[PDB]
């Protein structure tokens, strides 16, 4: 989701943004 992307981005940088976006 949008939130998961922001947090995921801060943790896994770019690659993190995508993971957070898809979530599952």
Automatic annotation (TrEMBL):
It is found in: Host apical cell membrane; Virion membrane. Palmitoylated. Homotrimer of disulfide-linked HA1-HA2. Interacts with human CACNA1C. Binds to sialic acid-containing receptors on the cell surface, bringing about the attachment of the virus particle to the cell. This attachment induces virion internalization either through clathrin-dependent endocytosis or through clathrin- and caveolin-independent pathway. Plays a major role in the determination of host range restriction and virulence. Class I viral fusion protein. Responsible for penetration of the virus into the cell cytoplasm by mediating the fusion of the membrane of the endocytosed virus particle with the endosomal membrane. Belongs to the influenza viruses hemagglutinin family. This is Hemagglutinin. It comes from Influenza A virus (A/swine/Scotland/410440/94(H1N2)). The gene is HA.
